[PDB]
Amino acid sequence: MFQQLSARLQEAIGRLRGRGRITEEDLKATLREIRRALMDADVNLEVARDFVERVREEALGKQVLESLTPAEVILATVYEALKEALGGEARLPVLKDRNLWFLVGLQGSGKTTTAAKLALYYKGKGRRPLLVAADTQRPAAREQLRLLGEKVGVPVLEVMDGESPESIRRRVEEKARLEARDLILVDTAGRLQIDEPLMGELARLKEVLGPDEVLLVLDAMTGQEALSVARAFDEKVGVTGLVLTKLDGDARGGAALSARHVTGKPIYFAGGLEPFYPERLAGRILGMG
Ligand SMILES: [Mg+2]
C-alpha cells in the first residue's frame, strides 16, 4: 500500500540493517529520511514532524543506539507510529435499534457506490437497510443509487425533485415502518466542489432528519485536499467518521496517515468495502502484507 512511501520507508529502515550499532547521526539521518518520505507522500507537515519525533522518542526508549540490530527496533517503532497515525485500533459506528446515517462527500469521492456497499455490508450482518437517494436536483444521481440498490438487493427511496426535508423525513419514516428498515443510509447530494448552497442544504437536512452518524466519503487520491474538504464538511455540517475510497490507487497515503491528527475523526471503512484496520495498513506499508 502507498507505493512510494512504502518503498522509501523500507529503504530507510533497510539501510540500517546488518551494520551492527548505529550512531546518533545515523539515527538522525534515518529520521530525516523518514520525514522527507512522509512529506513527499503528502502527509500533513505537522503530522510528519510529530511522527518522526514519536519514532525518535520511542526508539531511544528502546535503547536503539545500544542495539545490535537497530533496524529492527526502528521497524517496530515505525510500525507502531503508522498504526497510531492511522487510527490506533479498528473502529466502527455504533448501531442501535434504529439508525439513520448520512453519507456526505464530493461528487468523485465514490459516495454513492459506497452507500450501496455499506448497505450490503450491514445487510450481511443482519441489518435491514434502506438507501435514500437524497439529491433533490439531479435525477441521474438518484437513478444511480436505484440501480445499485437493485444490484445489492437493498431498497431505495428516491427523493423527488425539490422535495422538502420535512417531506423526505415523512416518506422515509413511512417506508422504514412498512419495510422494517433499521439502518437508513442517506446518500446526500454530491457536487464537484463545496459551496454555500450545498452546505446549507446539507445542514438543514441534518437538522430535520437527525442522523446519528455522518460519514464523509473521501477519495484518498486527493491527498491533503481531502482533509481540507473534511474540515469544511465538519464545520458546516458536522461529520462523525470517514470512509476512504480509492486507497488502492493512492501511492502516497497522506490523507490516511493524516486524518486522525488533522480531523479527529475515525476512518470507519476503506473502499468492495471493509472496515478500516489500521494495523493491517501499517503492516502493508512496511512490506509485511
Ligand atoms: Mg442549525
Curated annotation (Swiss-Prot):
Its EC number is 3.6.5.4. It catalyses: GTP + H2O = GDP + phosphate + H(+). It is found in: Cytoplasm. GTP binds at residues 105-112, 187-191, 245-248. Its main location: cytoplasm. One of its GO terms (biological process) is SRP-dependent cotranslational protein targeting to membrane. One of its GO terms (cellular component) is signal recognition particle. One of its GO terms (molecular function) is 7S RNA binding. Keywords: Cytoplasm, GTP-binding, Hydrolase, Nucleotide-binding, Ribonucleoprotein, RNA-binding, Signal recognition particle. Part of the signal recognition particle protein translocation system, which is composed of SRP and FtsY. Belongs to the GTP-binding SRP family. SRP54 subfamily. Involved in targeting and insertion of nascent membrane proteins into the cytoplasmic membrane. Binds to the hydrophobic signal sequence of the ribosome-nascent chain (RNC) as it emerges from the ribosomes. The SRP-RNC complex is then targeted to the cytoplasmic membrane where it interacts with the SRP receptor FtsY. Composed of three domains: the N-terminal N domain, which is responsible for interactions with the ribosome, the central G domain, which binds GTP, and the C-terminal M domain, which binds the RNA and the signal sequence of the RNC. This is Signal recognition particle protein. It comes from Thermus aquaticus. The lineage of its organism: Bacteria, Thermotogati, Deinococcota, Deinococci, Thermales. The gene is ffh. The chain holds residues 1 to 295 of 430 of the full protein.
